[PDB]
Each structure stands twice: as C-alpha cells, then as structure tokens.
Short mmCIF file of C-alpha atoms and ligand atoms in Angstrom, two decimals:
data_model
loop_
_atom_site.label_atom_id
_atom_site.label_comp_id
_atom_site.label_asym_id
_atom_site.label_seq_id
_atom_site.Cartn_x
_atom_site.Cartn_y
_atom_site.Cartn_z
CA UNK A 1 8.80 7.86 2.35
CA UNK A 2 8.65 3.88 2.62
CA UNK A 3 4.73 4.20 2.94
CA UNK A 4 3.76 5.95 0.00
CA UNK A 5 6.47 4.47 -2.11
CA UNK A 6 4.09 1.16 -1.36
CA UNK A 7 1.06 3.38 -2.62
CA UNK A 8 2.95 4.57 -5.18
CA UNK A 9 3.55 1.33 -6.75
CA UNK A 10 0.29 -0.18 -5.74
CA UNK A 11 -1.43 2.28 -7.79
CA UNK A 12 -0.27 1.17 -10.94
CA UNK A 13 1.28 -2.22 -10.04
CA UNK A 14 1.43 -3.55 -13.33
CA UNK A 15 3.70 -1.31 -15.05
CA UNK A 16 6.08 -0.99 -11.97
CA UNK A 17 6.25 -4.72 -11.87
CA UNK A 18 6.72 -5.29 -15.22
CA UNK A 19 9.51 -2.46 -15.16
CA UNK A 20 11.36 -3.49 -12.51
CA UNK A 21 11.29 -7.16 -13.09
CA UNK A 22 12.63 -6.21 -16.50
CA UNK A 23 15.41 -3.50 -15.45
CA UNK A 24 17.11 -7.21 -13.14
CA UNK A 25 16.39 -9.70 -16.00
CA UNK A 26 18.70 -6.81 -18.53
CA UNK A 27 21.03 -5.74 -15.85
CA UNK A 28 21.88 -9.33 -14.39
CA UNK A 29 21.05 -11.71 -18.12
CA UNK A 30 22.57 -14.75 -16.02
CA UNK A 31 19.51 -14.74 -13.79
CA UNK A 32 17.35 -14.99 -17.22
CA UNK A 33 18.25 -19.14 -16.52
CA UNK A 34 15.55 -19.12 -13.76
CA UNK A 35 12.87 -18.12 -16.17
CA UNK A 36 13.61 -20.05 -19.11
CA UNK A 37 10.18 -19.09 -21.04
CA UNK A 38 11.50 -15.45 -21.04
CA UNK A 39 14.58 -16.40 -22.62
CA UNK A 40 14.74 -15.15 -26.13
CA UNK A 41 12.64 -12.29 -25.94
CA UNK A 42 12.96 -8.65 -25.88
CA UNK A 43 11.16 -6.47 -23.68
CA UNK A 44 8.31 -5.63 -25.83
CA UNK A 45 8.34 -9.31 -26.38
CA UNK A 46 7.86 -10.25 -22.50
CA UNK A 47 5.32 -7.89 -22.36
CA UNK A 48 3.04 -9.29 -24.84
CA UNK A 49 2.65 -13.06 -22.87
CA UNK A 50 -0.25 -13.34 -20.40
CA UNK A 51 1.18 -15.08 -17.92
CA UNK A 52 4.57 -11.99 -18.00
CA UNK A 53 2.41 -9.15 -16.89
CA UNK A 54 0.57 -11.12 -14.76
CA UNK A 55 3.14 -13.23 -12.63
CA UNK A 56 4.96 -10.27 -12.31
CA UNK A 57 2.05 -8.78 -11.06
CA UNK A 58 1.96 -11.33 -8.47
CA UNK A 59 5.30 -11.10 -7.80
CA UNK A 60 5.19 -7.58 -6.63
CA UNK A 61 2.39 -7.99 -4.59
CA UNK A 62 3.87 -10.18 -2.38
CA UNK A 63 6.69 -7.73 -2.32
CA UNK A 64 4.17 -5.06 -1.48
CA UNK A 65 2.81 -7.43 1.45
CA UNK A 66 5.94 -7.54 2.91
CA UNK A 67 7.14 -4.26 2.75
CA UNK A 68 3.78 -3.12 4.31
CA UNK A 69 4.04 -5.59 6.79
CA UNK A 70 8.16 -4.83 8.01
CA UNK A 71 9.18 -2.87 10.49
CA UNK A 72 11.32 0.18 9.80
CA UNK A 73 12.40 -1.73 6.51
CA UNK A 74 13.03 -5.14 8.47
CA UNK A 75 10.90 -7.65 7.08
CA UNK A 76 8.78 -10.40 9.48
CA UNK A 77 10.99 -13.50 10.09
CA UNK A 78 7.76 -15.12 9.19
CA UNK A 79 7.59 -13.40 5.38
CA UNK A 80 11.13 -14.48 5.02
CA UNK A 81 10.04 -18.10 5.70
CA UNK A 82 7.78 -17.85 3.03
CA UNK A 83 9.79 -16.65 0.55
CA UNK A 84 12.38 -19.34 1.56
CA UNK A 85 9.81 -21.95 1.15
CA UNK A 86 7.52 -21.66 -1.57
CA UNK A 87 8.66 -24.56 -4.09
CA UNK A 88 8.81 -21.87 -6.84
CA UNK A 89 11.66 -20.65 -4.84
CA UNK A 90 13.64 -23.80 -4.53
CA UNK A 91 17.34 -23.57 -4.97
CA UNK A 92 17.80 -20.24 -4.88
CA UNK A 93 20.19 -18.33 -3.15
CA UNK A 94 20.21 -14.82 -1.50
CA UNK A 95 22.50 -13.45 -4.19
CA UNK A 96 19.41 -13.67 -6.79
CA UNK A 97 17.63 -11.36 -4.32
CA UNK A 98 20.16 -9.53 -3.43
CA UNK A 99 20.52 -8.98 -7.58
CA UNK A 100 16.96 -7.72 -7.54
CA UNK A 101 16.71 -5.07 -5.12
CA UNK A 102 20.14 -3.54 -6.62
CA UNK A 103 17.98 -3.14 -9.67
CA UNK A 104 15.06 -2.20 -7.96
CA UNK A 105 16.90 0.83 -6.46
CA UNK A 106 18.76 1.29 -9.26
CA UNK A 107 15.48 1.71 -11.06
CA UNK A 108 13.70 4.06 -8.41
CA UNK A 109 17.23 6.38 -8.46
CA UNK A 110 16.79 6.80 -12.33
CA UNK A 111 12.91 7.04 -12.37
CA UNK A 112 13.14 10.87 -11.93
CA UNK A 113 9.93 10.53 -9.68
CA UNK A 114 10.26 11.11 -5.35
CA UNK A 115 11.13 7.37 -4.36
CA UNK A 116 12.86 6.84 -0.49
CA UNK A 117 15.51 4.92 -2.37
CA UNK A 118 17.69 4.63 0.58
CA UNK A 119 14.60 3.03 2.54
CA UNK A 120 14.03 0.58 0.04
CA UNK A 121 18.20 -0.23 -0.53
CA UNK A 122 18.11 -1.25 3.75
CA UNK A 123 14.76 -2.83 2.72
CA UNK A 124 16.62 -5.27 0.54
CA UNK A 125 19.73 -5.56 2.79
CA UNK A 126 17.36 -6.47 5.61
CA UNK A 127 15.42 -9.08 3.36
CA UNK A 128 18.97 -10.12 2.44
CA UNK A 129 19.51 -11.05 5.88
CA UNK A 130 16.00 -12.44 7.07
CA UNK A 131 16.06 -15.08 3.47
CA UNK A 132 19.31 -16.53 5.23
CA UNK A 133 18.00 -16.56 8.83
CA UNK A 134 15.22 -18.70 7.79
CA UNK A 135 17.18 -20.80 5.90
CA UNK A 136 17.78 -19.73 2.55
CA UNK A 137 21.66 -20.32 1.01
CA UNK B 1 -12.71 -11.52 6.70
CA UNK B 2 -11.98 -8.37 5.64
CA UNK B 3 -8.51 -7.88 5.55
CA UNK B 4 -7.68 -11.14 4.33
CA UNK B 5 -9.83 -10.45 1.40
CA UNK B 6 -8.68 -7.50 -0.17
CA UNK B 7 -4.87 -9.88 0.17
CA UNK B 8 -7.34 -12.18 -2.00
CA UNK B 9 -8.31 -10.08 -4.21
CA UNK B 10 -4.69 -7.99 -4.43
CA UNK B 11 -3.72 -12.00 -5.96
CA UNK B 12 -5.03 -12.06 -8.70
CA UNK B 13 -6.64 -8.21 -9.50
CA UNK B 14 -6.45 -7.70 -12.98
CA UNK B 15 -8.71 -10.79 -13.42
CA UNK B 16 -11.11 -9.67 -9.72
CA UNK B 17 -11.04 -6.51 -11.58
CA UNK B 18 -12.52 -7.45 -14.70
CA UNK B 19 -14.91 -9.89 -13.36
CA UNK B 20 -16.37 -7.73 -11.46
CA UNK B 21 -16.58 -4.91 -13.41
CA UNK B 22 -18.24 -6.97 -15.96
CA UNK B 23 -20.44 -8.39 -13.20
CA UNK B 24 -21.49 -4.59 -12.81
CA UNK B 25 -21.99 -3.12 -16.20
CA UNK B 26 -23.97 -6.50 -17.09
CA UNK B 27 -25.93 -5.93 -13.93
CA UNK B 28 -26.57 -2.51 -14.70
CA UNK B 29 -27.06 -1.92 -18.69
CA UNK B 30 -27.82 1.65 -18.48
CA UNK B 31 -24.49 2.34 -16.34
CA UNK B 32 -22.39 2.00 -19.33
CA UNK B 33 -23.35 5.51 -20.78
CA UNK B 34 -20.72 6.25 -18.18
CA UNK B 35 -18.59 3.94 -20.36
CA UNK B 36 -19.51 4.54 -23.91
CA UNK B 37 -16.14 3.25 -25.18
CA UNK B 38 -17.27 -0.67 -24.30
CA UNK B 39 -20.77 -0.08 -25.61
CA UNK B 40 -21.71 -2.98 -28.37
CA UNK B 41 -18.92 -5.51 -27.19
CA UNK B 42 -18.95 -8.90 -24.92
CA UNK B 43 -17.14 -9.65 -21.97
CA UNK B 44 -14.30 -11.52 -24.22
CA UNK B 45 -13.67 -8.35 -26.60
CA UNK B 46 -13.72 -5.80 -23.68
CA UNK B 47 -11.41 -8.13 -21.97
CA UNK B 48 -9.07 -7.69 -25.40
CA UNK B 49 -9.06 -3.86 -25.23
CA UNK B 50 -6.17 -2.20 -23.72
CA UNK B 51 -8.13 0.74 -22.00
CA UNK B 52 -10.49 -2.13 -20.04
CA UNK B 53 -7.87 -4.10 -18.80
CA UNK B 54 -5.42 -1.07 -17.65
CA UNK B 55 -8.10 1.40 -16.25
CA UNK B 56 -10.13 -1.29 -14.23
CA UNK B 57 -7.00 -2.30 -13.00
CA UNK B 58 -5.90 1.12 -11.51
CA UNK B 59 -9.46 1.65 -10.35
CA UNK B 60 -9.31 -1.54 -8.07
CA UNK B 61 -5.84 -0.78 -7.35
CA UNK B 62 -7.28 2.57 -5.72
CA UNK B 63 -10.32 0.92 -4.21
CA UNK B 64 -7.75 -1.69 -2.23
CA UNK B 65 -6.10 1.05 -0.92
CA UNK B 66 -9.03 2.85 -0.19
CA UNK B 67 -10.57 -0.40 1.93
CA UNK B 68 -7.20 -0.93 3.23
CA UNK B 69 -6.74 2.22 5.14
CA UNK B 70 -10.42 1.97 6.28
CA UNK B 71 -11.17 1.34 9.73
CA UNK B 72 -14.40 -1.12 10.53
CA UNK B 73 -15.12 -0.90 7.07
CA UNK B 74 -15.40 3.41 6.93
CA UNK B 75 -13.21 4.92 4.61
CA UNK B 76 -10.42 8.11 5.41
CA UNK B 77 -12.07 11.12 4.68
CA UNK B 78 -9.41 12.02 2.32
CA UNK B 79 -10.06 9.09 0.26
CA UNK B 80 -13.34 9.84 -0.50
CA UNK B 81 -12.63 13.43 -1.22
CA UNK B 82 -9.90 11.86 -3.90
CA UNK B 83 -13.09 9.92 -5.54
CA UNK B 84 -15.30 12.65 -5.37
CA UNK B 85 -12.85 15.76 -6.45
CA UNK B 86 -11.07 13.48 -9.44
CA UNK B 87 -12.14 14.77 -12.66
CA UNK B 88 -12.82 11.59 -14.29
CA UNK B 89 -15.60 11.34 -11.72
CA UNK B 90 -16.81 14.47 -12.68
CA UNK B 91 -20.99 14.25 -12.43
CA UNK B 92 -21.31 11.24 -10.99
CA UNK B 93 -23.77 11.04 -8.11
CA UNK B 94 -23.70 8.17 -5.35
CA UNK B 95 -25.78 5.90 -6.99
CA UNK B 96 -23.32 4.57 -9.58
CA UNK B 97 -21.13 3.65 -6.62
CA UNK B 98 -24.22 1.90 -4.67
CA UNK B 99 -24.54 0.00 -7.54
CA UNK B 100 -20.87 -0.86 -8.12
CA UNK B 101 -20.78 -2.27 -4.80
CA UNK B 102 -24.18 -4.20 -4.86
CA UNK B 103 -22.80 -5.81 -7.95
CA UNK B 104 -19.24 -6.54 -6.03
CA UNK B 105 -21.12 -8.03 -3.27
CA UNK B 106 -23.12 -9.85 -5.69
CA UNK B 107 -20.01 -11.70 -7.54
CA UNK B 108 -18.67 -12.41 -3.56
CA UNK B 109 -21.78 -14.27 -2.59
CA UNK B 110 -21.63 -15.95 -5.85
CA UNK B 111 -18.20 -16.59 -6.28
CA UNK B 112 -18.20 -19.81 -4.12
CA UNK B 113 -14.76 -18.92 -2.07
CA UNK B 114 -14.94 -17.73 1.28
CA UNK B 115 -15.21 -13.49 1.02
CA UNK B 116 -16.38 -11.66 3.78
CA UNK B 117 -19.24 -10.26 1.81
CA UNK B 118 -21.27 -8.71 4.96
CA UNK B 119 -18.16 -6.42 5.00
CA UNK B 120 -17.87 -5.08 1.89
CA UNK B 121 -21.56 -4.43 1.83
CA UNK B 122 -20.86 -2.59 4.51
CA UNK B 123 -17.82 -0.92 2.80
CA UNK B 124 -20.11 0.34 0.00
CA UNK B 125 -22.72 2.11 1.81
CA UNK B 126 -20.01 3.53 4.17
CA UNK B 127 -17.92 4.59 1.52
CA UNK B 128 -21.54 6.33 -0.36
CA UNK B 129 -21.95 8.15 2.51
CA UNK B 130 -18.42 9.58 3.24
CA UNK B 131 -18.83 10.38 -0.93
CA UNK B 132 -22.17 12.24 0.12
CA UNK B 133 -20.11 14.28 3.21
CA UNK B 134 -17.24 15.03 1.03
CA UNK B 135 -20.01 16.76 -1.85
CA UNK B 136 -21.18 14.63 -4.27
CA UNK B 137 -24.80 14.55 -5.30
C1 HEM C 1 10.95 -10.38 -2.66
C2 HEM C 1 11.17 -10.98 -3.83
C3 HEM C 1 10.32 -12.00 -4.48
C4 HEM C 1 8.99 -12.21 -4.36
C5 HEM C 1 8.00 -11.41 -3.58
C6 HEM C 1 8.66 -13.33 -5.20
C7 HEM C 1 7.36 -13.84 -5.35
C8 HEM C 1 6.99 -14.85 -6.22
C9 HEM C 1 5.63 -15.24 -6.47
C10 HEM C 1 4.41 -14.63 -5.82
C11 HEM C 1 5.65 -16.22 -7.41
C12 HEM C 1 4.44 -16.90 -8.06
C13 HEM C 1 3.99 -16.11 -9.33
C14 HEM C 1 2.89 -16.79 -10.09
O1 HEM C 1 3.06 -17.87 -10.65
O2 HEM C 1 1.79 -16.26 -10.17
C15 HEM C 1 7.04 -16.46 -7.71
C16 HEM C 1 7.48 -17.41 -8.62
C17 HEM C 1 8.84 -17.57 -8.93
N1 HEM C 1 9.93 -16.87 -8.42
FE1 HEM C 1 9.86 -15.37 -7.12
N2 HEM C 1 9.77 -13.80 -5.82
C18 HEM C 1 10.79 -13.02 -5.43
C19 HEM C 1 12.11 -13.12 -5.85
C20 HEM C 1 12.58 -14.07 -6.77
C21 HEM C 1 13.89 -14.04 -7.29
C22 HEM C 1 14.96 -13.08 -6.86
C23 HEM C 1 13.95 -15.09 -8.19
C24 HEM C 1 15.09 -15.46 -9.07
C25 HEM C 1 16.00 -14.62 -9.55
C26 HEM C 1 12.66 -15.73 -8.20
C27 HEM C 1 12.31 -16.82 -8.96
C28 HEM C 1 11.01 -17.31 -9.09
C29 HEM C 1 10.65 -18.37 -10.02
C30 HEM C 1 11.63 -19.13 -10.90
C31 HEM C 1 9.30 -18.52 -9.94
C32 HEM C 1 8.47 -19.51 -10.73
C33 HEM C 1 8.51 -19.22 -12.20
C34 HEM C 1 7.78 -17.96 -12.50
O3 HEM C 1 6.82 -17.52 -11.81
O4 HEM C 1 8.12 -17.35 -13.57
N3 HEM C 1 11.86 -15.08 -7.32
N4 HEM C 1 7.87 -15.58 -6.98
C1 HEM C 2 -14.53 3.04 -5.20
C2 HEM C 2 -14.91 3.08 -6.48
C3 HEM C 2 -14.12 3.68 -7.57
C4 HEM C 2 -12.78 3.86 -7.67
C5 HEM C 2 -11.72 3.41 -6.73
C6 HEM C 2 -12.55 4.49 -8.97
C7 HEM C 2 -11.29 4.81 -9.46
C8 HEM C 2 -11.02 5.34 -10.73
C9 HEM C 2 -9.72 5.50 -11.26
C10 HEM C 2 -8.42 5.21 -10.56
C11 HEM C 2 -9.90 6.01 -12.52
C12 HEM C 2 -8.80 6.30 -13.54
C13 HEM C 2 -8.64 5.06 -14.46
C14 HEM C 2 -7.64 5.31 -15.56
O1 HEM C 2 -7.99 5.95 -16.57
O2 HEM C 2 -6.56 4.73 -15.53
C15 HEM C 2 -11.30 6.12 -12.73
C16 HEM C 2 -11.85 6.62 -13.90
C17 HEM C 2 -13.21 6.71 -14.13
N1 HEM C 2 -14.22 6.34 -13.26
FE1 HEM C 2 -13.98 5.55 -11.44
N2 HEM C 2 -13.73 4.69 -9.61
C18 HEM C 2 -14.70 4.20 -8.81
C19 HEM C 2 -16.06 4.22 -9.09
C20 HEM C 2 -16.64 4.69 -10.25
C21 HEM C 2 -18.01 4.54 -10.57
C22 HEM C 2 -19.05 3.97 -9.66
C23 HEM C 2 -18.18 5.08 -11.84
C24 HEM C 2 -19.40 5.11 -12.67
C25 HEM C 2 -20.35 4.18 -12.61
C26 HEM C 2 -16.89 5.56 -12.26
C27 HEM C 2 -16.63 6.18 -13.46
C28 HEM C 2 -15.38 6.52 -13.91
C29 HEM C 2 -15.16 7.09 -15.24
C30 HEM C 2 -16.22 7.43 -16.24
C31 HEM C 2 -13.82 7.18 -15.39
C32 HEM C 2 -13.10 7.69 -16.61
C33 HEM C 2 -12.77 6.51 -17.56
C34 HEM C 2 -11.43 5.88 -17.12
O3 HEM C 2 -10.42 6.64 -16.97
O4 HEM C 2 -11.37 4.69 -16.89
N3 HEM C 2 -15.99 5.31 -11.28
N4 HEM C 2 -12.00 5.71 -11.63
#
C-alpha cells in the first residue's frame, strides 16, 4: 500500500526521482520552461549534470515527507503551505502539480512492479486541493 | 534531535552518505578489505566511481529507514534480521557496524551543525545488539 510505496521509493530514491521527474518533463515538454537549464537535453543528457540527480533527489524527498506525514493520502495544510511558499515555487499554479502526479501515476501503472497507484492518484488530487487552500493559483 | 536529523540528513544523502562513509573507511584502514574495489584511491576518485556513489547511497537510504521506524533509538527486529540475513553482509560480525557508527558519530560531533549525536550513538550500539539477537557473530 501507500506505506511501502514510500519505502519503496526511499530505497532507491535516486533513480525513482530521476525517473519520474523525467516521465512529466517528456509527457508535459511545456513545463520544460520552468527549468530552463534542462532545456535542450535528452534524458541521458539530464542525467549526467550534478545538480539533475541531485535536486531531483531533493525534490522527492520532500515528496516523501509529505506523503509520510498525510493522512489517508490528505496531505497537512501545513506541508501545503510550504510548498506554496518556498520562493523556488513562485508563480506556479496547481495545474503544474496537478501535471506531475498524472505522470507520477502514470509511471507507477506502467512500472510493472506492486505500486497502490490509486492511493497515490487521491494523493495528488488531495495535494491538488491543499496547494489552493493555502493559497496557491 | 533525532527525528529531525535523519530529515537532515534525508536533504542532502548522497553527499551525508559519502562523507561519512569516507569518514569511516579513513577511520578504519583495515575495514576496506570489506571494500576491496576502493582500495588505492582518494576520497575525490571514489567519489567519481559509479558503484561508491550508488551503493552508499542505498545503504543510507536503508539505514534512514531503519532509524526511522526505531523507537527510542532501538531498531524493529525485522530490520536487523534484513542486515544480518542479506547476503552482501554475508560474514560480517558486529564490529564493522560498531565501527561504522563510532565513525558516524564522529563526523556529527565534528560536523559543526546541530545533530543529536548522543542519539545515534545510542542507535549504533542498539542496533549491534539487535544484529547480535537476530545471529550475527
Ligand atoms: C510535491 C511536489 C513538489 C515538491 C516536493 C517540490 C520540491 C522542491 C524542492 C525541494 C526544491 C529545491 C531543490 C534544490 O534546489 O535542491 C524545488 C525547486 C523547484 N521546484 Fe519544486 N517541488 C514540487 C513540484 C514542483 C512542480 C510541479 C514544479 C513545476 C512544474 C516545480 C518547480 C520548481 C522549480 C522551478 C524549482 C527551482 C529550480 C530547480 O530546482 O530546478 N516544483 N522543488
Ligand atoms: C546499518 C548499517 C548498514 C546498512 C543499512 C547497510 C546496507 C547495505 C545495502 C543496502 C547494501 C547494498 C548496496 C548496493 O549494492 O546497492 C549493502 C552492501 C554491502 N554492505 Fe552494508 N550496510 C550496513 C553496514 C555495513 C557494514 C558495517 C559493512 C562492513 C564494514 C557492510 C558491508 C557491505 C558489503 C561488503 C556490501 C556489498 C558491497 C555493496 O553492494 O555495496 N555493510 N549494505
């Protein structure tokens, strides 16, 4: 279930990161314009700059965080926040995370492995909902 | 304290990783016939090699979730059955991990941030003897 899907990834964080992250960036190339040091650059490309792996890294941790921290797949109010208000973050809008847990799923559906896809698909639906309750457009 | 530091360390764990790994097999010489791959090279070229980088990775992945699920610092049972029963671990005896952890407390003391280092000292000798309960010599 939800659990070990966060052990799951934990235990090799790196390569889930850096697969996920990749399986938005080539299903939605518009959101490619956020990340314009990426742009350019196949996969194998992306893969071979330091700060890639490792922001990605980074990326899914706090992911991890949060989805160890929600309840029943609803995130804290209080993660949302910080999402909404890290200055990395500025300007976005839900849609871009919305984007990224399609692919996420997408990616867990297709991974042939035992995922809880449908855990993590109200996972993003609920973080969908907490971004714009703490203020995110 | 403690659960605030394995957050800290889940930040930025490639790098934790490496550093203290290093910290370890530079501490103790003789504990890299256990590593003979990374005999004969400094920090900088082992931190070039793909094996280093990925497999100390996955091991602190593991050892996060291992401290993680603890409770007051004493690891699940289960866990340390995983580290003992693993083949790579195959032979090992509970004085590599003492060591492992006197080094890790080491590079906390050192480090000059704020790690709860009293509690992963703790960690290591609780986690040594749950190795001992669960078989190894
Ligand atoms: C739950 C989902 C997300 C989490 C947990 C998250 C987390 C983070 C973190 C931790 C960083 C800092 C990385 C570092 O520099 O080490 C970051 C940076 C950033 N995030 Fe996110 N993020 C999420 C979703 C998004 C989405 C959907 C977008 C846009 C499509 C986005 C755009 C950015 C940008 C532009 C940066 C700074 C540039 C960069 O690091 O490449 N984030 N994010
Ligand atoms: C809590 C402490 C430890 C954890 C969590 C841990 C975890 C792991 C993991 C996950 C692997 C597989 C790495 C991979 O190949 O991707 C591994 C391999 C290995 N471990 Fe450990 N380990 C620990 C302590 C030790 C200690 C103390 C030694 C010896 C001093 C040791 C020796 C080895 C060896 C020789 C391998 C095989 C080489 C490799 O695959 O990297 N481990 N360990």
């Amino acid at each position: 279930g939800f659990k070990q899907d966060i052990a799951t990834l934990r235990g090799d964080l790196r390569t889930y990161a850096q697969d996920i992250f990749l399986a938005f960036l080539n299903k939605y190339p518009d959101e490619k314009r956020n990340f314009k040091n990426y742009v350019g650059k196949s996969d194998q490309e992306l893969k071979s700059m330091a700060k890639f792996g490792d922001h990605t890294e980074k990326v899914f941790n706090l992911m991890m965080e949060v989805a160890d921290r929600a309840t029943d797949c609803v995130p804290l109010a209080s993660d949302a926040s910080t999402l909404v208000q890290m200055k990395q973050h500025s300007g976005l809008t839900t849609g871009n995370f919305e984007k990224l847990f399609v692919a996420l799923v997408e990616y867990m559906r297709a991974s042939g492995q035992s995922f809880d896809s449908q855990s993590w698909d109200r996972f993003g639906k609920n973080l969908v909902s907490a971004l714009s309750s703490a203020g995110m457009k």
